[PDB]
Design an enzyme around this catalytic site. Sequence first.
Site, PDB file in Angstrom:
ATOM      1  N   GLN A  79      50.323  58.389 111.619  1.00  0.00           N
ATOM      2  CA  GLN A  79      49.322  58.366 110.566  1.00  0.00           C
ATOM      3  C   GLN A  79      49.195  56.959 110.002  1.00  0.00           C
ATOM      4  O   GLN A  79      50.199  56.276 109.783  1.00  0.00           O
ATOM      5  CB  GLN A  79      49.698  59.361 109.460  1.00  0.00           C
ATOM      6  N   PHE A 129      45.009  60.340 111.412  1.00  0.00           N
ATOM      7  CA  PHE A 129      46.207  60.490 112.216  1.00  0.00           C
ATOM      8  C   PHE A 129      45.813  60.726 113.666  1.00  0.00           C
ATOM      9  O   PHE A 129      44.658  61.038 113.977  1.00  0.00           O
ATOM     10  CB  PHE A 129      47.137  61.608 111.696  1.00  0.00           C
ATOM     11  N   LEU A 138      46.558  73.009 112.019  1.00  0.00           N
ATOM     12  CA  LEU A 138      45.711  72.115 111.232  1.00  0.00           C
ATOM     13  C   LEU A 138      44.223  72.411 111.384  1.00  0.00           C
ATOM     14  O   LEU A 138      43.411  71.808 110.674  1.00  0.00           O
ATOM     15  CB  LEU A 138      45.985  70.650 111.620  1.00  0.00           C
ATOM     16  N   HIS A 142      41.556  69.767 108.804  1.00  0.00           N
ATOM     17  CA  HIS A 142      41.354  68.355 109.105  1.00  0.00           C
ATOM     18  C   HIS A 142      40.247  68.224 110.136  1.00  0.00           C
ATOM     19  O   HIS A 142      40.184  69.011 111.083  1.00  0.00           O
ATOM     20  CB  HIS A 142      42.641  67.712 109.644  1.00  0.00           C
TER      21      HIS A 142
END
Length: 183
Positions: A79, A129, A138, A142
Amino acid sequence: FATRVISAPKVTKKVFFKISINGEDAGTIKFGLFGDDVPKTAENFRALCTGEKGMGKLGKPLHYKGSPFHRVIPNFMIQGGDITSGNGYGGESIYGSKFADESFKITHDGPGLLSMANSGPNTNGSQFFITTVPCPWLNGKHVVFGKVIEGMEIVKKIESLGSQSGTPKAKIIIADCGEITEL
Protein backbone atom coordinates in the site's frame (compact mmCIF):
# COMPACT_ATOMS: atom_id res chain seq x y z
CA PHE A 1 -9.93 -6.28 -35.00
CA ALA A 2 -9.22 -8.27 -31.83
CA THR A 3 -5.71 -9.70 -31.45
CA ARG A 4 -6.46 -11.36 -28.10
CA VAL A 5 -9.62 -12.87 -26.64
CA ILE A 6 -9.42 -11.22 -23.21
CA SER A 7 -10.88 -12.55 -19.95
CA ALA A 8 -10.37 -9.27 -18.07
CA PRO A 9 -11.29 -5.58 -18.33
CA LYS A 10 -9.65 -3.71 -21.19
CA VAL A 11 -6.45 -1.77 -20.47
CA THR A 12 -6.89 1.73 -21.91
CA LYS A 13 -3.99 3.64 -20.36
CA LYS A 14 -0.53 2.69 -19.14
CA VAL A 15 1.55 4.28 -16.36
CA PHE A 16 4.67 3.38 -14.41
CA PHE A 17 6.52 3.68 -11.10
CA LYS A 18 10.28 3.58 -10.72
CA ILE A 19 11.03 2.12 -7.29
CA SER A 20 13.95 2.84 -4.99
CA ILE A 21 14.63 0.78 -1.87
CA ASN A 22 16.88 2.45 0.70
CA GLY A 23 17.91 4.75 -2.14
CA GLU A 24 18.91 1.96 -4.57
CA ASP A 25 17.13 1.62 -7.91
CA ALA A 26 14.86 -1.43 -7.81
CA GLY A 27 13.33 -1.29 -11.29
CA THR A 28 10.09 -0.25 -12.94
CA ILE A 29 6.51 -1.39 -12.33
CA LYS A 30 4.15 -0.78 -15.25
CA PHE A 31 0.37 -0.61 -14.79
CA GLY A 32 -2.57 -0.86 -17.14
CA LEU A 33 -5.68 1.09 -16.15
CA PHE A 34 -9.29 0.00 -16.78
CA GLY A 35 -10.43 3.36 -18.11
CA ASP A 36 -13.44 2.03 -20.01
CA ASP A 37 -14.84 0.66 -16.74
CA VAL A 38 -13.81 3.19 -14.07
CA PRO A 39 -12.71 6.30 -16.01
CA LYS A 40 -12.80 8.70 -13.07
CA THR A 41 -10.70 6.45 -10.83
CA ALA A 42 -8.28 5.62 -13.64
CA GLU A 43 -7.93 9.31 -14.54
CA ASN A 44 -7.17 10.24 -10.92
CA PHE A 45 -4.37 7.66 -10.81
CA ARG A 46 -3.02 8.62 -14.24
CA ALA A 47 -2.86 12.32 -13.39
CA LEU A 48 -1.16 11.60 -10.07
CA CYS A 49 1.52 9.70 -12.01
CA THR A 50 2.23 12.69 -14.26
CA GLY A 51 1.76 15.44 -11.67
CA GLU A 52 0.03 17.52 -14.37
CA LYS A 53 -2.61 18.94 -12.01
CA GLY A 54 0.00 20.89 -10.00
CA MET A 55 -0.57 21.82 -6.37
CA GLY A 56 -3.36 20.35 -4.25
CA LYS A 57 -5.59 22.02 -1.68
CA LEU A 58 -3.53 20.48 1.14
CA GLY A 59 -0.35 22.26 0.02
CA LYS A 60 1.47 19.34 -1.64
CA PRO A 61 1.99 18.47 -5.31
CA LEU A 62 -0.68 16.16 -6.76
CA HIS A 63 2.05 13.72 -7.75
CA TYR A 64 3.01 10.23 -6.59
CA LYS A 65 6.72 11.02 -7.01
CA GLY A 66 8.57 10.76 -3.69
CA SER A 67 5.74 9.02 -1.81
CA PRO A 68 6.48 5.78 0.08
CA PHE A 69 4.95 2.35 0.30
CA HIS A 70 3.98 2.85 3.92
CA ARG A 71 2.24 -0.46 4.64
CA VAL A 72 3.46 -3.79 3.30
CA ILE A 73 1.81 -7.03 4.47
CA PRO A 74 3.20 -10.30 3.06
CA ASN A 75 0.55 -12.61 1.59
CA PHE A 76 -1.92 -9.71 1.38
CA MET A 77 -1.00 -6.45 -0.36
CA ILE A 78 1.36 -3.49 -0.56
CA GLN A 79 0.00 0.00 0.00
CA GLY A 80 1.22 3.48 -0.89
CA GLY A 81 0.12 6.79 -2.38
CA ASP A 82 0.08 9.08 0.64
CA ILE A 83 1.28 12.15 -1.25
CA THR A 84 0.54 14.71 1.47
CA SER A 85 1.91 13.34 4.76
CA GLY A 86 3.73 10.23 3.54
CA ASN A 87 2.77 8.28 6.67
CA GLY A 88 -0.45 6.50 5.69
CA TYR A 89 -2.91 9.09 7.02
CA GLY A 90 -2.79 11.60 4.17
CA GLY A 91 -3.41 11.89 0.46
CA GLU A 92 -5.51 13.91 -1.98
CA SER A 93 -7.32 13.21 -5.23
CA ILE A 94 -7.23 15.47 -8.29
CA TYR A 95 -10.89 16.31 -7.75
CA GLY A 96 -10.49 18.77 -4.87
CA SER A 97 -12.29 16.48 -2.42
CA LYS A 98 -12.37 12.76 -1.77
CA PHE A 99 -14.44 11.12 -4.46
CA ALA A 100 -17.20 8.54 -4.60
CA ASP A 101 -16.78 4.84 -5.17
CA GLU A 102 -17.14 4.66 -8.94
CA SER A 103 -17.88 0.95 -9.45
CA PHE A 104 -17.39 -2.35 -7.62
CA LYS A 105 -17.82 -4.42 -10.81
CA ILE A 106 -14.13 -5.41 -10.99
CA THR A 107 -13.27 -7.74 -8.12
CA HIS A 108 -10.09 -8.67 -6.22
CA ASP A 109 -9.70 -12.02 -7.95
CA GLY A 110 -5.92 -12.38 -7.85
CA PRO A 111 -2.52 -10.81 -7.28
CA GLY A 112 -1.34 -7.74 -9.14
CA LEU A 113 -4.58 -5.73 -9.04
CA LEU A 114 -4.58 -1.98 -8.37
CA SER A 115 -7.29 -0.90 -5.95
CA MET A 116 -8.14 2.26 -4.00
CA ALA A 117 -7.54 2.38 -0.28
CA ASN A 118 -10.14 4.34 1.65
CA SER A 119 -11.60 5.12 5.06
CA GLY A 120 -15.20 4.17 4.37
CA PRO A 121 -17.76 4.63 1.60
CA ASN A 122 -16.93 7.32 -0.96
CA THR A 123 -13.58 8.37 0.54
CA ASN A 124 -11.18 7.80 -2.36
CA GLY A 125 -8.10 10.03 -2.38
CA SER A 126 -4.63 9.07 -3.63
CA GLN A 127 -3.81 6.02 -1.50
CA PHE A 128 -3.88 2.72 -3.39
CA PHE A 129 -2.82 -0.86 -2.88
CA ILE A 130 -1.61 -3.73 -5.06
CA THR A 131 -2.93 -7.19 -4.18
CA THR A 132 -0.48 -10.03 -3.84
CA VAL A 133 -3.18 -12.71 -3.24
CA PRO A 134 -6.90 -12.91 -4.11
CA CYS A 135 -8.82 -10.66 -1.68
CA PRO A 136 -12.52 -11.39 -2.34
CA TRP A 137 -13.47 -10.15 1.14
CA LEU A 138 -12.58 -6.64 -0.15
CA ASN A 139 -15.15 -6.81 -2.97
CA GLY A 140 -17.76 -4.09 -2.61
CA LYS A 141 -15.45 -2.09 -0.31
CA HIS A 142 -12.56 -1.01 -2.57
CA VAL A 143 -12.65 0.08 -6.23
CA VAL A 144 -10.33 -1.99 -8.44
CA PHE A 145 -9.16 0.09 -11.38
CA GLY A 146 -6.02 -1.43 -12.89
CA LYS A 147 -3.40 -4.14 -12.86
CA VAL A 148 0.33 -4.71 -13.01
CA ILE A 149 1.38 -5.39 -16.62
CA GLU A 150 5.16 -5.46 -16.04
CA GLY A 151 7.45 -5.72 -13.04
CA MET A 152 5.40 -8.00 -10.80
CA GLU A 153 8.74 -9.32 -9.54
CA ILE A 154 9.34 -5.83 -8.10
CA VAL A 155 5.98 -5.98 -6.31
CA LYS A 156 7.07 -9.33 -4.86
CA LYS A 157 10.41 -7.81 -3.80
CA ILE A 158 8.55 -5.02 -1.99
CA GLU A 159 6.21 -7.57 -0.41
CA SER A 160 9.20 -9.54 0.91
CA LEU A 161 10.31 -6.44 2.84
CA GLY A 162 7.01 -6.24 4.73
CA SER A 163 5.98 -7.49 8.13
CA GLN A 164 2.93 -8.89 9.88
CA SER A 165 2.25 -5.44 11.34
CA GLY A 166 2.63 -3.86 7.89
CA THR A 167 5.60 -1.72 8.92
CA PRO A 168 8.12 -2.17 6.07
CA LYS A 169 11.71 -3.17 6.83
CA ALA A 170 13.21 -0.76 4.28
CA LYS A 171 12.37 2.66 2.83
CA ILE A 172 10.47 2.01 -0.42
CA ILE A 173 9.85 5.12 -2.51
CA ILE A 174 8.22 5.91 -5.83
CA ALA A 175 11.43 7.47 -7.14
CA ASP A 176 9.77 8.49 -10.41
CA CYS A 177 6.46 7.96 -12.17
CA GLY A 178 4.59 8.98 -15.26
CA GLU A 179 2.43 7.99 -18.19
CA ILE A 180 3.60 5.61 -20.89
CA THR A 181 3.24 7.64 -24.10
CA GLU A 182 6.13 5.99 -26.01
CA LEU A 183 3.57 3.22 -26.58
